[PDB]
Structure formats: C-alpha cells, structure tokens
Write a protein that binds this DNA or RNA. Structure first.
Length: 564
DNA sequence: GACTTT
DNA sequence: GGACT
DNA sequence: GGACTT
C-alpha cells in the first residue's frame, strides 16, 4: 500500500519575501529514509512522484506554502479529482484537514499524493508531543528571523533541528498507527473505537440519524464549559486559597449520568413529565434576574448575566440547564414554546471507558497519552455539525491566498443530543459544587473551582478524592493570587521537594513557591514577562504571532497582545 | 470557541 | 479572549 | 467520503 511521511518546512518571515528555505521529509515506517533540502521546487517534484500520504504538523501553516506553489505550477482547485488539480478539506471555520494533489491516471493506477495535518491526530505542539511521548527532542528553537536569501545553505545545527522535528512526529504517528488509531483525526479514532465496543448494530439502533431540522433545534442547546470569575475578586489581590479539579470531568459524566438516546418526540408548549422520555430540551422565552446569593448560569458572552436587561432571552435548554436556571434566577414573562423529549439510560459508555481507562492506568508514555486521547476525544464527535460546507482557496490579485465559501454540503448528524447532555451534566457538576461553596468561590473553569482559604469545605468533603472518577481532587493550594478576567490569573502555589523533585505542597508542608501564569491567548514568551507586580489590565507586549497571508505563504507577524 | 506554525 | 483568511 | 465544537 501507500507509504507515509512526516514533513516540515522552515520559512522566511518577511511579508515582502515569504518562502520556504528548508524542507524535510521522513518515512514514518522507516525513519532511516529521509531528506532535508533548501528548495520547495525540489520538495514538490518529490511530492508529485511519491504517491504517498504526507503529514505536516499544523497544516494550516505549511499548507499555505504548498497551495501557493500549486497555483503557480499548473494546478488548479477541483472537487472532482481531475488530472493536474488539487482538492482540499478546509472547514468553514478555517480548520485544515487535507490537500489531495491529483496527477491523473497511469495504466490502472490513480496517481496522487495526499497531505494531512498531524495536529488533527496529535493535538499538541511538537515539543509537548516529544515530552509526553518520551521521544528525543533537541533544546531550543531555530533562529526564525535570520537573514536567509534564496539558496541559503542550511547549517548542521538547522539541519539537526529539522530532522528532530520531523522524527518526533514520525515516531509519535507510528506509535499511534500501531495501536490501530489510523483515521484522519483523534475524534474519528475515538468514535470508531466506541462503535467497535458497542457494535455498529447497536449504535444505529440507539443513535438514529435525526433530520437536519431536528438536529438544528437540538444544537441550539449545545454549549461548552462553565468559566466564570466572581466579580467580588475581579482584579483584587487574593491571599491563600485552593483549587479543586474533577477527575476526568467528561468521561465521568459519560460513565454515570442519565443520557439521551433514540428518536426524539417533539412537543408544543411546556414539557409534561414522561418517565419513558425523562430528558428534554425546552425552547423558552423569558426575562430573568439573578437571585441574591447565586452564581449566574445564563450566557447569551463571554460573561454570565445577572439580568436580561429588557432584551427577551430566547433559549433552548436541556432540562439540566433549565433546572439550574430556574433555581438561580427569578424568571419573568415566561413563554414555553416547544421542545423535544428523549429516552434515556446510564451505561452506554461503560465498556469503552473501562477499556481505555485500564490501558491508561497500566501504560506509560506514548500509549498512556493515546489512551487519554481516546477517552477525551469521544464526546465532541456526537455534536458534529452536519453542515460541512467548506472554504476553497484561490490566489488573490496580489498573489496571496484568499478563501471563498464553497458549495453547500451536508452529511448525516452523529447524535447531537448526547453532546448537549454530556456538557450540561459537566456544567451541572461544576456549578453545583461552586454554589455549595458560594461563600468562598473565586473562579470556575470547566472542571475546576478555586476557593479562598486552605481547608476543604465540609459540604464537599464526601465528593473529594485524589483519583476516583468524577470526584474532586484537591489539586493545589496557593499563598496568593490575582484574577483579572476569565482564563486570566496568576498564583503563587505552595510546592514541596520530594525525592529531589518539586510537587504540590501545603501551607504547613512546603519548601518553595511555583509562580503560575494563566491567560488565554498569551504565548509562553509573553508569560515569561509576567510578574505579580506587572500583571494587571493594560499589560501589553508586541510579541504575539499572528498569521497573515502574503504572496508565497503565511508570515507570522508579531502583534500587540494586551490584557483587556 | 482556534490554541499552532515561522 | 476570541481566530474563523 | 473524509471532516469534534462556531
């Protein structure tokens, strides 16, 4: 069958002169077959002849260079696999999955080279993959901005970095493929594995294909994690506190919660209790005002709302979310419009989760990471959007890539109600624990609650455990902290030296402090600049790479990052 | 609701 | 915090 | 065909 290669480019960083200055490829099955060179023309000649499957890490980047070349070297876009054309899978939202370059046919053979994104398989930076998969990695980075003219001679040091980059991804992908995880994406692998375990026969019976109209209604109720900063603590210096984190939040909901299956039944007005269809999604219009003493749960944000402010809220809510809302808010002018009710059961994920949890628990390094990936990448596939209308590349007048929305396309839904309820139960888990600890609650993010003080609250003692699925682990304790916004905080965390290594400590048992920085969108280089003294709204650094399409490819231009 | 790449 | 060219 | 979320 087809050979597989791990590939990379190094590129120049001038908007007026953007080009590949190095390429590397390495056979994923035979890491001894590899080549590094300084010509995209040379690389692409190989691409056209190799009739293989190629992988770049973060194809959205390298892919720009490839398409720029194709468009200048006699290839046009086609969905239909015509000779001397290329097809793509680029989503509406700009996720890159595939470039398929068609040469035509020779004798019986379809001649093509397919290029995939290894980031879809291994959703971490290369450096993190090497660390977690226990693979050899060289310290440091290439000097990105060094002056490199056309034909620039690659140094031994640059060559070694490029070889290491492609070999890390080759090693990681080979391990993944040897486990049987050889579909296009981590989520696709997870879903296939789940079907293997429950059987396709059962899957089809219990997760029937919903009409596009019904799927759209269900999807209105699909929301993600609960992330919230208590205004009481916004931009304030905090003393001691502690963090609890659920042990495997989403798998825990899948393992034990009542979850929907089967063909829904539509109803008008307000849901009437049906023990046989005990879960529902309710379309409701209302105004609302948060009750004193309660955490807000309605996001229409980023922020969770205290009030509808005279704008009528038009919501589709799972019963889990609806009951939270009714408890946390006073509701006014309520109109129950319509909804959908579902059969439900526990246990649909037991065997899958048991299998991969065992592998996780009994394995190390690479295989352990893959078990985590299988467990973590399943729920999201249930709410896959049946609208798969994509984006088509083209060369703009200036010679840079532009993208147009392509032809309308739909596919079958998977089973969106399952996604709606998995995330609803996850939110319920976190919101209810935070609410129980209302007097001390600082911040929530998805599976974690942060409290003032250092003693475990009595009200959650019985649901705290360092390891047990779905319980809250006491993750850390801090000496001081500062929270500016959602996903934007720092902590001085108590640590202790054990066996010559630093691990989480406590106020009564610490040796040192770990200074921890969390800020969404902040790069690691910018994180190095942060201190307790300078961490405030208005903190700014012109150090955030932003991708710009230019003639030849993409330049990552350093842009201003500001805490707003 | 992306999350990485030079 | 906020990309989706 | 493929393709977690918008």
């Amino acid at each position: 069958p087809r050979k597989m290669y791990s590939c990379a480019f190094e590129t120049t960083t001038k908007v007026e002169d953007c080009r590949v200055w190095a390429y590397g490829y390495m056979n994923i099955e035979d890491h001894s077959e590899y080549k590094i060179g300084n010509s995209l023309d040379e690389f692409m000649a190989w691409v056209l002849k190799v009739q293989a499957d190629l992988y770049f890490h973060n194809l959205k980047f390298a892919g720009a260079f490839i398409i720029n070349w194709l468009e200048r070297n006699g290839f046009k876009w086609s969905a239909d696999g015509l000779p001397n054309t290329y097809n793509t899978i680029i989503s509406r939202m700009g996720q890159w999955y595939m470039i398929d370059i068609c040469l035509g046919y020779k004798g019986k053979r379809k001649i093509h080279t397919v290029i995939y994104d290894s980031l879809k398989k291994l959703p971490f930076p290369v450096k993190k993959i090497a660390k977690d998969f226990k693979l050899t990695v060289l310290k440091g980075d290439i000097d990105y901005h060094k002056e490199r003219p056309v034909g620039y001679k690659i140094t031994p040091e640059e060559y070694a970095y490029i070889k290491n980059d492609i070999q890390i991804i080759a090693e990681a992908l080979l391990i993944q493929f040897k486990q049987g995880l050889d579909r296009m994406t981590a989520g696709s692998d997870s879903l296939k594995g789940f079907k293997d375990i429950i059987t396709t026969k059962k899957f089809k019976k219990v997760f029937p294909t919903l009409s596009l109209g019904l799927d759209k209604e269900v999807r209105y109720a699909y929301r993600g994690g609960f992330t919230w900063l208590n205004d009481r603590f916004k931009e304030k210096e905090i003393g001691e506190g502690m963090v609890f984190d659920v042990n495997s939040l989403y798998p825990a909901q899948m393992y034990s919660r009542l979850l929907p299956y089967g063909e829904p039944i539509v109803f008008e007005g307000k849901y009437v209790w049906d023990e046989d269809y005990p879960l529902h999604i309710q379309h409701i219009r209302c105004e609302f005002e948060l009750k004193e003493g309660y955490i807000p749960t309605i996001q229409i944000g980023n922020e969770y709302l205290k009030s509808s402010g005279g704008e009528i809220a038009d919501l589709w809510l799972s019963n889990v979310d609806l009951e939270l809302m009714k408890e946390h808010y006073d509701l006014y002018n309520v109109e129950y419009i319509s909804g959908l009710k579902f059969k439900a059961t526990t246990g649909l994920f037991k065997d899958f989760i048991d299998k991969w949890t065992y592998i996780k628990t009994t394995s190390e390094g690479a295989i352990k990471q893959l078990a985590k990936l299988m467990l973590n990448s399943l729920y999201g596939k249930f709410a896959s959007n049946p609208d798969v209308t994509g984006k088509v590349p083209y060369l703009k007048e200036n010679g840079a890539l532009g993208f147009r929305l392509g032809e309308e396309e739909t596919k079958d839904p998977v089973y969106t109600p399952m996604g709606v309820f998995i995330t609803a139960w996850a939110r319920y888990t976190t919101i209810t624990a935070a609410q129980a600890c209302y007097d001390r609650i600082i911040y929530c993010d998805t599976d974690s609650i942060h409290l003032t003080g250092t003693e475990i609250p009595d009200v959650i003692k019985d649901i705290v455990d360092p390891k047990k699925l779905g319980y809250w682990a006491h993750e850390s304790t801090f000496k001081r902290a500062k929270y500016l916004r959602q996903k934007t905080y720092i902590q001085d965390i108590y640590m202790k030296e054990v066996d010559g290594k630093l691990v989480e400590g406590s106020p009564d048992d610490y040796t040192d402090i770990k200074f921890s920085v969390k800020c969404a969108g902040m790069t690691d280089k910018i994180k190095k600049e942060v201190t307790f003294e300078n961490f405030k709204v208005g903190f700014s650094r012109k150090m955030k790479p932003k991708p710009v399409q230019v003639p030849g490819g993409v330049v990552l231009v350093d842009d201003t990052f500001t805490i707003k």
